[PDB]
Write a protein that binds this ligand. Structure first.
Ligand SMILES: [Cl-]
Ligand SMILES: [Cl-]
Ligand code: NA
Lengths: 90, 91, 86, 90, 85, 89
């Protein structure tokens, strides 16, 4: 905080975009990355204070499940200080 | 304001094309993105006025269900100001 | 003469086989070829409505015999936009 | 004329390469195209006289079934005159 | 210069696993591979013991978060790899 | 030295492990890597037929251990019409 990251992965782009907007609506988080690794998987990564990050991912997960298919939801309170040099989480 | 988002996701290009065609016919909307993320999924994104986008999306979902499988249907009336930095939702 | 007919398969060979069967069966023109991943290939032909229908019927038949047919559709009057994405 | 087309589609690159090798060994055919449209699918396209193309595809099909999994086998005796404009079959 | 490898399906499990690996020991993320079908691979390098400790933590985290596909350690990667690998 | 060794696995890790085992097993050269979807990764090696056989067998076993082996194959004497559309050299 404010370096905590929230992670949402859906099966479908529309569920992911819906979740993304729901996440930034619900808390003061910043979208820092989007990953599409195939087989329908789309991942949206947000950063901010750990409290806001959890609020974001909770709202994002609910929206993803309603719009399409939620695959994963996760929070990393303190990412490794050098993680952001290999994965976009800043 | 003319930044409402309409979202359709189907299985396969043909159902998505049919859907996209139905959306632009239905109302004053603009296709702003097309995404292909695997497992047969194809997504069509449109923008325009809220009413136009709602109408286009309804037409999109109906056509999608006829040609193939409709996976997702969604509307975002008032997108977060940061959404477009990172998703293509603008004309 | 601006109607389009669409054949989508899960595999290149079934798509190519369908494409040839279509132009053989009617005086249509292959105008586009789309591959959206995971084996999906779409062939788009253009012509008069009656013949794109005959073409897609022949294409669908051949696609099913050769491989896996995913979709078959005809749009008599497609829009004049769609755009750079479609 | 030597413009008949022989088509083999496999799942897995190894089955396709093995099949491709069997196809040119089996007859007087020439590898014209190679396609990989996702989901493991690999296509091999050969050209030549109809009889040779027939012999090539049967050998390719057998090898593909041995090494991996055969998806499609097809022969087009006389391809449409403008087929080779949207599809590499020369 | 041993390497440790973690592969998952889904980016989320992979990012969590990578984070665990660099936290666990003296390793450095030197590569990342996404070969399709949702598969995501992360590779770290360093001394053997550290690489081993990282992958254990990496595999543990990956299984908790999502689905772990493969976990492996190569104490000394061959030089004849660095052209297509 | 024209023989081809072919290994196909699920996932990058099983493939890299297999590739590593192959180049350590004999005097072969990795000439290609192919990722054609559904999790499939292929590694192709070339060299003398004996070396290719030893490499291929050692790669396949490592592949079974790390992940799943899909295909294993050896082409002792590949046709010359193959190299024009397939990286085997
Ligand atoms: Cl909204
Ligand atoms: Cl043969
Ligand atoms: Na319109």
């Amino acid at each position: 905080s404010s370096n905590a990251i929230g992670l949402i992965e859906t099966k479908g782009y529309v569920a992911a975009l819906a979740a993304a907007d729901a996440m930034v609506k619900a808390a003061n988080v910043t979208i820092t990355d989007r990953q599409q690794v195939g087989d329908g998987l789309v991942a949206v990564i947000v950063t901010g204070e750990v409290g806001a990050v959890k609020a974001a991912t909770e709202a994002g997960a609910e929206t993803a499940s309603q719009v399409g298919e939620l695959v994963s939801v996760h929070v990393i309170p303190r990412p490794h200080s050098e993680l952001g040099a290999h994965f976009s989480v800043s």
